[PDB]
Amino acid sequence: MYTFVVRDENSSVYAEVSRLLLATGQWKRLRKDNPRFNLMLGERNRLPFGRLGHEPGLVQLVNYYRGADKLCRKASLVKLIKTSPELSESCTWFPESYVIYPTNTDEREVFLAAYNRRREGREGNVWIAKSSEGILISSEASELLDFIDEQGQVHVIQKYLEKPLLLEPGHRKFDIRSWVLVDHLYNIYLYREGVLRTSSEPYNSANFQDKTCHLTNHCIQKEYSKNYGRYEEGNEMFFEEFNQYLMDALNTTLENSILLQIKHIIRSCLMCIEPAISTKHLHYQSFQLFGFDFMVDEELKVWLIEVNGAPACAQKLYAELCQGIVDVAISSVFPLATSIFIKLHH
Amino acid sequence: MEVIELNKCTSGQSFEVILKPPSDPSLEEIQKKLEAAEERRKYQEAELLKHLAE
Amino acid sequence: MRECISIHVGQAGVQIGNACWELYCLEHGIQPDGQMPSDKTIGGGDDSFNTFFSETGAGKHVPRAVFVDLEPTVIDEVRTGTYRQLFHPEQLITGKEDAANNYARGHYTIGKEIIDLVLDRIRKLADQCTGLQGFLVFHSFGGGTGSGFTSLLMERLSVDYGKKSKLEFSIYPAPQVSTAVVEPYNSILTTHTTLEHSDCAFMVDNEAIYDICRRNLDIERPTYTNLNRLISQIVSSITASLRFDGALNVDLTEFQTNLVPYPRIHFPLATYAPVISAEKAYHEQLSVAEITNACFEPANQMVKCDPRHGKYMACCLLYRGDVVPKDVNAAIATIKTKRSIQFVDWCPTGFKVGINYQPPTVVPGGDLAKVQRAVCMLSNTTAIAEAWARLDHKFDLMYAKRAFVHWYVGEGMEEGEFSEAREDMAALEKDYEEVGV
Amino acid sequence: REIVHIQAGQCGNQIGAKFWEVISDEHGIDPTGSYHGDSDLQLERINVYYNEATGNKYVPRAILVDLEPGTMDSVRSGPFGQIFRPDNFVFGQSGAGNNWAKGHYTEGAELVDSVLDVVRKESESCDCLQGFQLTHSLGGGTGSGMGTLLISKIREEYPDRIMNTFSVMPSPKVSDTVVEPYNATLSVHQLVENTDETYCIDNEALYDICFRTLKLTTPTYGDLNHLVSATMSGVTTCLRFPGQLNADLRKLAVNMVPFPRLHFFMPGFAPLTSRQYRALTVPELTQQMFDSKNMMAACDPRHGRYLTVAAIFRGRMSMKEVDEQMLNVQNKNSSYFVEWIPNNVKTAVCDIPPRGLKMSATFIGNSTAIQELFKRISEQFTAMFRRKAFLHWYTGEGMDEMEFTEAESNMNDLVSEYQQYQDA
Lengths: 346, 54, 437, 424
Ligand SMILES: Nc1nc2c(ncn2[C@@H]2O[C@H](COP(=O)(O)OP(=O)(O)OP(=O)(O)O)[C@@H](O)[C@H]2O)c(=O)[nH]1
Ligand SMILES: Nc1ncnc2c1ncn2[C@@H]1O[C@H](COP(=O)(O)OP(=O)(O)CP(=O)(O)O)[C@@H](O)[C@H]1O
Ligand SMILES: COc1c(Cl)cc([C@@H]2c3cc4c(cc3C[C@H]3C(=O)NC(=O)N23)OCCO4)cc1Cl
Ligand SMILES: Nc1nc2c(ncn2[C@@H]2O[C@H](COP(=O)(O)OP(=O)(O)O)[C@@H](O)[C@H]2O)c(=O)[nH]1
Ligand SMILES: [Ca+2]
Ligand SMILES: [Cl-]
Ligand SMILES: [Mg+2]
Ligand SMILES: [Mg+2]
What we know:
The structure is cut from a larger assembly and holds chains A (about 350 residues), B (about 55 residues), C (about 425 residues) and D (about 425 residues).
Chain A: E1 2-6, H1 12-22, E2 27-30, E3 39-41, E4 61-62, H2 69-72, H3 74-83, E5 97-100, H4 108-120, E6 127-130, E7 136-138, H5 141-150, E8 155-159, E9 174-182, E10 188-191, E11 195-198, H6 218-222, E12 236-238, H7 239-250, H8 254-277, E13 285-286, E14 288-296, E15 302-308, H9 315-330, E16 341-344
Parallel strand pairs in A: 1-2, 1-3, 3-4, 4-13
Antiparallel strand pairs in A: 5-8, 6-7, 6-8, 9-10, 9-11, 9-14, 10-16, 11-12, 14-15
Helix pairs in contact in A: 1-9
Chain C: E1 3-9, H1 10-27, E2 53-55, E3 61-63, E4 65-69, H2 73-80, E5 92-94, H3 103-126, E6 132-140, H4 144-160, E7 165-172, H5 183-194, E8 200-205, H6 206-215, H7 224-243, H8 252-259, E9 269-273, H9 288-294, E10 312-321, H10 325-338, E11 349-356, E12 373-381, H11 385-400, H12 405-409, H13 415-436
Parallel strand pairs in C: 1-4, 1-6, 4-5, 6-7, 7-8, 10-11
Antiparallel strand pairs in C: 2-3, 9-12, 10-12
Helix pairs in contact in C: 1-4, 1-7, 3-4, 4-5, 5-11, 5-13, 6-7, 9-10, 11-13
Chain D: E1 2-8, H1 9-26, H2 41-44, E2 50-53, E3 57-60, E4 62-66, H3 70-76, E5 89-91, H4 100-105, H5 107-124, E6 129-137, H6 142-157, E7 162-169, H7 180-194, E8 197-202, H8 203-213, H9 221-235, H10 237-240, H11 249-256, E9 264-270, H12 282-290, E10 306-314, H13 319-332, E11 345-350, E12 360-367, H14 371-385, H15 392-395, H16 401-423
Parallel strand pairs in D: 1-4, 1-6, 4-5, 6-7, 7-8, 8-9, 10-11
Antiparallel strand pairs in D: 2-3, 9-12, 10-12
Helix pairs in contact in D: 1-6, 1-9, 5-6, 6-7, 7-14, 7-16, 8-9, 12-13, 14-16
Bound molecules: guanosine-5'-triphosphate, phosphomethylphosphonic acid adenylate ester (ACP), the ligand COc1c(Cl)cc([C@@H]2c3cc4c(cc3C[C@H]3C(=O)NC(=O)N23)OCCO4)cc1Cl, guanosine-5'-diphosphate, calcium ion (CA), chloride ion (CL) and 1 more.
Calcium ion binds next to loops of chain C.
């Protein structure tokens, strides 16, 4: 009989995994501040890693990788890609990005040096401004740059994918979310079920000012969008239907046109930071569930937009993924008395 | 990757290698702390014996 | 030649002091009776080992040491031990009753009655020094004597020897090895009072030593003798440059200069490799590249923490054995490209390297096999703040209920001293955070 | 180092005599006081409980006290009766009639100064006396009334030595007289103020163990006292035997008592024996020890939480195995160990086993569950006091009933102070 502790009540993923552990009879949940735990479903912020692995007679396992934030926060990801030789200043699958600090090192001199050149070259020069809401798309550097002087958080602006793969019917954008499990042996497990977040609005290249045709986020579509849920339920398309659409329209498959690149991007990012976050010879053990966000352009080329460290699953998939977290991540360290994952290995 | 200030002797060697350039109370104060704690102990003992006297 | 005086306080300091001086005698070829045949000058010396050993007309080399414990028993075994003749009676100070795991009882109640006696015996050794650099102080964080009396002694040594360096070897508490329940209190108390009197403190987590003894020596329940013999090798590795001809860390001031840029942050992490069981019949001897790489494995650190999530202020590699400078730079060049070793911005990213050709001495009948080359890395990393966070948390849990506080107030301490001490630690953790992230 | 042992009253002297018979056998001392052992671990810390008289004779540092001569006359003619220093028998002739007031105020006052005479002589012959241990019951007159009177006099003269008692709690199941809740309520008042640590030995728990588990249908006081001397031997083992952990009374009190008034311990022993050959294992030895049926205060530990626990294992066994099992009992029922005292369970091992057992485990717990014991006594107290019943025995000795109200209030406060820590 194992003991675990919960420290983030909000996570729908790790609330469901706690129920499953309890539903085996062999796991009991302790109070928050009881330090005699086998497993910790710790908090998102300021998780006390310095206190793990010191309890005598206890193998301790936490559901987060210490140092994984370098991948999961925007500005850090941009600096991680540009400065890591294992990703090159330019990797073909990440948009040209520049991190720039507000009025209150900075690459705004470097961005305008590239932005101006593209303006002189007549090449389309739309860029997107983001931070870790408050999202701005524009075709002039000054419009975006003044926009971030109001904000107090360091911002990053990257090239906007002006030509996206547009699902028909609707002429509409999508983003692919993949769920990745890294266990304590640093095996990388891609969940065989992803999701497409569909915009319910036709894509317009004239006004990047109206939000709905450009932003596929569920909340940006549930509220601020006009015909949410018209083409698919809840503006969510799953892989089986996306595969059928690619076969029908583009005469290809999801595995070849997109999924090989997704597996390459996930592997590159996680192998890159492995020596910095691996718990291979550590006094405690870590696993973590990740959410990778991908974009597909008109040439069926995959771009990485963001990696999310505390991700939430789709309601239908919740049961299958939360169960897989137990078998792959938790019961591999604490046994009890086909696979839904694709293993990514070198 | 340079080696500086290398010294050699019979017992061994020492050197430096730079990979990248850079980018109290007095005696009486103590006697008083120690004596302040002593009276607090004495004051407690007296209250006990006063209670034991009752 | 400038002398160093060693001070061993409480059970842990005395017993570790036993382990060290046993090892120092083997490393310098000193018999248990005090005779050193290799020394060609009788009754006098300017040699490097004279920094730790005075000389007598009869040829006896006597440690420049003081052993003080409020309980008589642990020092009574130095008196009856194999090295009994080595030590002068006036060097071994005992009391009648111990401090009961109570910092306040050791600092105030019993500390007052014996502090002036310890200082007279220490001056009796300082008066035989032509030029003293300072003191090496060995103690536990958790014991009543080790915490309470040491911090009192540190205050009076700062008064009586103001121009002198003071170095600390401190045993950090760990529940695997027999601990009191109030050792967090004693640890925070003695740190707050000693922080401004110590110039460099080498901290040793009993959990780390215990775990190395089970993994590398495959002892399933180590004893103090196992722990101390291992701690003695690390200590010997750190103090070797004081007792041998060399050009790196030749006096106590240089430990401060090379390892402690900011004074409050004066707790270098020590990492030691290789540790191999003597029972290993067939054993393959590790190289410079291997043992220098093991110096960045957390399982070889004296304190369990993750240096990857910190910043280095200073790094010093102390090799012992068949090591050559060429192989150190090769091993360094490959490790830097394979490991997350981020220095602070205001410090040079580099390594002060010291090589001593004599491979580590090991005690006959010990658990440590003799190797051809070994290395101790002394690194000042902000990662050791994790050790303070652990300790402060245990302190906070007990203090929220004022648990066990009455024992300390009963010895004349004031409850406010708890909060002042805790507030100092909050400042210390902040200082690590400023430099660290 | 040195401990002075005092045994007061019939129960105090009967459990004390059994205690000395047991540990004299463990240390290899025959009834004449002559050592006859084969190991030398026995004699290394023998001075804690024995003075060495001339002729290689070991004499217990024990003082025997009673207001009635009969009980000590049986001791002197008992098995190890001649091993005690003849001058250390101090007794009157009147008895205390199971009356706390007689032991504390009238007959006991007439005799307390000569007991303290002997306590001084034994203390002066101490290299560095660490404290005193008192064996008594709380339900009679001599051991409870004159016993607690002895404690406060001893504290007045040695205010900085440790005061330790083995106190037998009365139970209607094993009752001599109806006034036992009165004598116990008055004694607990004294103990809660003048002792550093009290081992609560509930006669009800002893009776249930002798009947429910040991299967003895009609238990005698000898049956109960078999369990007490076994318990007493286990708790004192670390004091009187060489080990990796060499224990003393003060470090015990510093680590077991997070708050001054909460110093009432419930002990536990395994294997529970009746006056076998199948040796236990460290797993089953640990599970029995922590079970209620092995505990000497008739409380349910699951109804409270452990503030601190000290445990010792006797015999040849793996210390790695003792660690796993103790760490296993914690990690499996960590609900019953408080989170604001980190690492509050300590464990020791002594390879010298008790007589007749290959392996044994003894348990000292500061649990909030002990409040059930004082709740029981306060209820039996109130049932009579609300009608002033049997009080004339006490007012006849000069006590006013206001002193009864004060002693009842202080015990209810004690119960209440244990309650608050059961929740935090
Ligand atoms: N590494 C090591 N640690 C020890 C040794 N002896 C004691 N300790 C540790 O020291 C702490 C207890 O402090 P002690 O040195 O025994 O206590 P003390 O300084 O004698 O003070 P008092 O006994 O309270 O008067 C515990 O955390 C032990 O784990 C030892 O020989 N080696
Ligand atoms: N370079 C780019 N080109 C096109 N669209 C982009 C883009 N960068 C961001 N987006 C848009 O932003 C939307 C979501 O915002 P983004 O992923 O940048 O932050 P976010 O907070 O909404 C997700 P996360 O929780 O993973 O950080 C995507 O659906 C996509 O349409
Ligand atoms: C019969 O067994 C005993 C006896 Cl008598 C006394 C002890 C106590 C003790 C008790 C503690 C504890 C620490 C210590 C320290 C230890 C020591 O170094 N010397 C000493 O006297 N100690 O932490 C929480 C709970 O209780 C332990 C045992 Cl096991
Ligand atoms: N366990 C135990 N309890 C006893 C013994 N003798 C008496 N008692 C209990 O102690 C109380 C009576 O105290 P007693 O020692 O006879 O009175 P005293 O001699 O006047 O102090 C009653 O609760 C008895 O049940 C004994 O030998 N063993
Ligand atoms: Ca010489
Ligand atoms: Cl000076
Ligand atoms: Mg001690
Ligand atoms: Mg009777």
